[PDB]
């Protein structure tokens, strides 16, 4: 009933969804073919799966998500691998021609062909829906389908669905390592659209996941599979209070009204704790003080910018597993008495806490350990301004003498939208400065 | 000489060892929520989508909206 409809757009978003639905199937005990075992069944009136799955006629729990990619490669991999009988055969929506790292190609061209079919499928999923809580939209700022087509989906979902909160998980580009070359152009062009149509934009840095994996999980050669597994664990820890009962239950609207101060600062920072492996976890106590100090430890956030050069505004602590609010609020008190975590002066209390009893689950052979307690830090710091300034530096340095602009102009973009998006993100930076001071 | 396989048929995976592994201790408990009586009431209240016999009062101004012809 607390249904949480999902759209995974782009190759990156499709891989996030491929990890996420594996994790959700394991969490709710759903077999890959779609059915649920009878010895597993704790009664026919179970209702946790209704958030993410719908039971059609015979225990066939189909997932409530739409996979999008203009090139058919990753969705055909989904259709041929493991979770092939789970998804609806038409929900895995694809084109044939790809945008190929081009916001203008994803926005003003062939992306404008399948948008009607894909959000018609969104509309029919929402017609099947009855208690729609929000839209979980997974994409990347790297470029192409996840940059322009995602922005088109934001615009049409916004002025088709009313308030209808839209949480946007995005793979933000790293400071130094990167894959595409026009990726700063795609990021700058996508932010200008997502600013007025998103509600909680969770930026995820690939380099941040990489060094978190190699120092915490002790994985010497991590990869995109581990990246999407960790992101899946975090989004499950976010929307686990809707699926399981808790001592303090937080919903997708309490989260928003306790997170964002003003309706332009909606760019939080996610952080999971613990992200330690089994061998390190078996030798350590892992109490609530340690899982809070791991979250507030500044080499653990998921965008490469330390929060010490910034002021915390809101913190949505989502505790999961066997935790007690007494250890929680003792840890919150000692975090407040810690001087180096400087809260902002107009926010006396800034901790929204949600306790859930359900312990986190692990995939059969990943890198995270089956820990009895975990916590999702959700910062609203001003430290993301450093990442915004780095992308401004990259965009201005490549836009100094009009490099890689003829592609966008040929696809259909005018020459002015680059300047409009630069001015918009500069205004956003001015807003961050005037709210930080 | 075996050929290279897919992504799925690898150790380190998205869909390997998913059938033989089932999370027994974690989610066989009452921690998972049920569809009891007062969630069944909310799910059965969906059958009154805009068919309820509540009509607007004649002492209210928004009455000629629903009675335009008279």
């Amino acid at each position: 009933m607390r249904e949480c409809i999902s759209i995974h757009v782009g190759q990156a978003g499709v891989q996030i969804g491929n990890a996420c639905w594996e994790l959700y199937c394991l969490e709710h005990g759903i077999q890959p073919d779609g059915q649920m075992p009878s010895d597993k069944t704790i009664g026919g009136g179970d209702d946790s799966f209704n958030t993410f799955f719908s039971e059609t006629g015979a225990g066939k729990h189909v997932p409530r998500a739409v996979f999008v990619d203009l090139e058919p490669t990753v969705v055909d991999e989904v259709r041929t691998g493991t979770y092939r009988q789970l998804f609806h055969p038409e929900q895995l929506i694809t084109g044939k021609e790809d945008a190929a790292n081009n916001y203008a190609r994803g926005h003003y061209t062939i992306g404008k062909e399948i948008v009607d079919l894909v959000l018609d499928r969104i509309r029919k999923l929402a017609d099947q829906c009855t208690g729609l809580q929000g839209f979980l939209i997974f994409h990347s700022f790297g470029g192409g389908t996840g940059s322009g087509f995602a922005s088109l989906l934001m615009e049409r979902l916004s002025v088709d669905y009313g308030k209808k909160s839209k949480l946007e998980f995005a793979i933000y580009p790293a400071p130094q390592i990167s894959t595409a070359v026009v990726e700063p152009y795609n990021t700058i062009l996508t932010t200008h659209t997502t600013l007025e149509h998103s509600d909680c934009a969770f930026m995820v840095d690939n380099e941040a996941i990489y060094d978190i994996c190699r120092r915490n999980l002790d994985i010497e050669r991590p990869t995109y599979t581990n990246l999407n597994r960790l992101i899946a664990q975090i989004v499950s820890s976010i929307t686990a209070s809707l699926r399981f009962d808790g001592a303090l239950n937080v919903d997708l609207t309490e989260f928003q009204t306790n997170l964002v101060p003003y309706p332009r600062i909606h760019f939080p920072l996610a952080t999971y704790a613990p992200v330690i492996s089994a061998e390190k976890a078996y030798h350590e106590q892992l109490s609530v003080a340690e899982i809070t100090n791991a979250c507030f430890e500044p080499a653990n956030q998921m965008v490469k910018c330390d929060p010490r050069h910034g002021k915390y505004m809101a913190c949505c602590m989502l505790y999961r597993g066997d935790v007690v609010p007494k250890d929680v609020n003792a840890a919150i008190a000692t975090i407040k008495t810690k001087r180096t975590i400087q809260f902002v002066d107009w926010c006396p209390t800034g901790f929204k806490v949600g306790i859930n009893y359900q312990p986190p689950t692990v995939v059969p052979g990943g890198d995270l350990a089956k820990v009895q307690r975990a916590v999702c830090m959700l910062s609203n710091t001003t430290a993301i301004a450093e990442a915004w300034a780095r992308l401004d530096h990259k965009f201005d340095l490549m836009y100094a003498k009009r490099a890689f602009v003829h592609w966008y102009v040929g696809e259909g973009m005018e020459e002015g939208e680059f300047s409009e998006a630069r001015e918009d993100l500069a205004a956003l930076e001015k807003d961050y400065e005037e709210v930080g001071v | 000489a075996p050929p290279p396989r897919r992504r799925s048929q690898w150790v380190g995976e998205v869909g390997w060892f998913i059938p033989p592994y089932h999370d027994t201790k974690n989610t066989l408990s009452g921690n998972q929520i049920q569809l009891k009586v007062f969630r069944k009431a909310q799910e059965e209240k969906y059958t009154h989508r805009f068919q309820e016999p509540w009509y607007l009062a004649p002492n209210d101004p928004d009455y000629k909206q629903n009675f335009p012809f008279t």
Binding site: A278, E279, Y282, V362, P364, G365, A369 | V11
Partner: peptide
């Protein structure tokens, strides 16, 4: 305690699987 021991056994079985695949690919190379 039983949960942690079962988890460690699962990790050991996975690591045995990667040892098996790497020795298989070594025999493939030879």
């Amino acid at each position: 305690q039983k949960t942690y021991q079962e988890q460690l056994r699962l990790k050991r079985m996975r690591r045995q699987a990667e040892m098996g695949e790497e020795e298989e690919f070594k025999r493939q190379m030879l």
